[PDB]
């Protein structure tokens, strides 16, 4: 993890980093071009860059976004917003979650379109913009798919009521209506899409809104790819920009690898144990590799006696408890593993692969749960 | 997570952070003074500040270190070392894990004492020292307690030879011998302590080393507090500095809390579901608070339908899957919860406590496996 950085930018190199996240510029640009080709100019692309470009580094990723002429960017935090703007990007910038009031106030300076899900919230936010003499562009969130997270519940009369109240705020300008799908299943997306079509219709008619000044947007990566009719005015794709999307969609390239270094290989006698609480017993005279990565680097404890890594193409297993900063792996069967060798914690190496699915199985949850936190806990390096 | 920072220091505030880590200065200073008094001047104190000071911020902790005259600091990465030096620390700086060779080389500039646990590594390390015209002070790691992680196995004859080989390197100046305990258990500790004493005797004799020019150190926090005969010349304390140690040792104060904000509270009708995959069903008309923290902030997916948070001192349950950036909690029983309210994710709030124990139970591993990543993924703010 760099302790000095400038708008998402570090001064580290692979040589002086204990572990690093490698981000492929050309995989990114390929996935952008692919998505653009799939939209075929019928819908527009908004790149979802929350969680610091999903752990890829918003400051690394932005120059590709600008290069490919992407017109819309979605972020979550104020620092992400600040970095988007400092990169020169001048287009539509929207937050894809509710902000707290004081967080929202601090982001007025970035001309961000803010998300609104409540009459009370809308009232509070309206007062903040009034105080600063700004008109704040807002996307009203609807609970059409049923996340019950950011959105107003338009399947009740109370909801429709809050929705009119929201449209009555003098210093808010409603520029969009959105929802978010709760389940990556085509049937369930279509149920949600039908609900979203009815509820936006109802609003636009009954609150006398201009359909032509509104961007209607519902689709994430899955929906965009699997349910074209969910494309509407604009799509919000995160995972597919990064090659983390529908497994069958192999036209999207993986933009990230997670790597470290062998510091040294050591000889340990049979009967020796490894790591805290001695959870692994050596059944033969071993050679153990000491790798400069641990759970403080996001290589989570749960990988204890479960993980595999790649060195020189070989699939080598983790032994003992993962330490804070150090990981032991068994290279008894791989005499070619040397101090200085590159390790692959996630990705591909010379014919070997550590897969998304093997990691999700160990972790008990989706990979973004690990990689968003890899990206924070280690320096990112743009390659390709 | 700040995307600009200068030597572990950021320009963010509680008011513009979606979530943050509060580090208590006075807890840190209390813990140092207590440690020092307990060591009663009989043994040297080396503050282990690995993993960005265990998630507390090495740039935030250093001034206390310097002021209380701690003479030794232990770190893992080059950035930590760089920061320790930038803060005006001029004393003994030791790495407590093996570095890779190019990592080690980039660190020469911080006059850090390096760990060594191999003849091969030693020779390799000898050659870099040579090439740079430096004598590198080294600590030699011994596998006395059987971590089988960093140290030479002195329980074998090849081990002993490797050891003697290490002491033979012309550009390496051995200043210390160390080991690390594998089990937090008094008896297990004494077993390892007896072995360390024998094996250090053996080595001092056979290498003809000046005992009085050597520091012997084995003890971390548990050993230091629980087995005083393990204190030797110098201890290496991590958790105790931060109040994460033996649960009965309550003289050490918790230095960290993990907090966030309520963005808004929403109404949703019975039978609505919450979050991705609809994993929680509202059994009553509900008020759901939207909290601006998620797994990309280190609030791990495992807390789904499991975590509790504090708002206005109330113990409030997490409902649904934790999103990347947003967490939903049920505030139907708690009408005093409003947009703006401060949420405690870990720590104390007005009579409520989210404990180390309860979080370790949901996580399936020790709390450091969470908080070192909280610290990377969020702004650290110094209080008290």
Numbering used by the authors:
A (entry chain A), B (entry chain B): 26 to 409
Provide text from the study.
The asymmetric unit in the Bar crystal contains two molecules. With the exception of the positions for the first 25 residues, those of all other main-chain and side-chain atoms are well defined. Non-peptide electron density near Lys75 was fit with an aldimine bond between the Lys75 Nζ and the PLP C4A. The Bar molecule contains two domains: an N-terminal (α/β)8 barrel, which contains PLP, and a β-stranded C-terminal domain. Two Bar molecules associate to form an AB-type dimer, and their positions are related by a non-crystallographic two-fold axis. The Bar A393Y mutant exhibited detectable, although reduced activity towards L-Lys (55% residual activity).
Notably, Lyr is also active against arginine, whereas Bar racemizes arginine, lysine, methionine, serine, cysteine, leucine, and histidine, a useful feature for biotechnological applications.
